[PDB]
Automatic annotation (TrEMBL), chain B:
Origin superkingdom: Eukaryota
Quaternary structure annotation from Swiss-Prot or TrEMBL: Interacts with the second and third RRM domains and C-terminus regions of PABPC1 in a 2:1 stoichiometry.
Subcellular location(s) per record: Cytoplasm
Lineage: Eukaryota, Metazoa, Chordata, Craniata, Vertebrata
Gene source species: Homo sapiens
Protein name: Polyadenylate-binding protein-interacting protein 2
Family, similarity comment: Belongs to the PAIP2 family.
Role: Acts as a repressor in the regulation of translation initiation of poly(A)-containing mRNAs. Its inhibitory activity on translation is mediated via its action on PABPC1. Displaces the interaction of PABPC1 with poly(A) RNA and competes with PAIP1 for binding to PABPC1. Its association with PABPC1 results in disruption of the cytoplasmic poly(A) RNP structure organization.
Amino acid sequence: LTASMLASAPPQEQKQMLGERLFPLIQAMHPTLAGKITGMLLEIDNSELLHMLESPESLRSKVDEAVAVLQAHQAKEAAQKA
Amino acid sequence: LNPNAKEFVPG
């Protein structure tokens, strides 16, 4: 995925385009959380997302943060309702 | 990061 490819699409479609490339990677890392974690990351600036697509360590760091945030959110909500 | 973000659906 290139910046020129992205530049060719409207903003919501740019997010889909990035998501289609990120998803198989994020899914490999966390199959059960794949769509949610991808959605969380897609809120980030596109320039940073392009960077993450080319930098496995950057993607791993961000995914680790998203997983921690998602799991803490879900567990906190469960604890409050339990 | 927003844990209430919309689920991404591959299409």
